[PDB]
Design a protein that fits this description.
The protein is mainly beta. The protein contains one helix and seven strands; from the N terminus they run ββαβββββ. It comes from Shigella flexneri.
Amino acid sequence: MNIGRLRDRITIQTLKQTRDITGEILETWEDGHTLWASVNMVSSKEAISSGAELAIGTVRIWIRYRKDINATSRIKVSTGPLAGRVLNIIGQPLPDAARTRLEILCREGAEK
């Protein structure tokens, strides 16, 4: 029984790139749908496993199967262990092989 069921919530930040009446690209994050998630950070296990593609501190995010999530989206934790933190999606949102869920991988978007 996969114990990584939905306990928390995540917010899908889709990137609204709206052009201007003279023509600049106004890149803004259209804060979107807040769905059922389980937001669990990695151990050294899957970091060491992935070598240097993933890192120690990578945020894993387990949701039901949603092919709408993109790598250019950002994930803000509406509630959970990182309640208030906005993580950014690294690599690509990898769909579960049996299509029962979606493995969203992220890291803390430390902008300091």
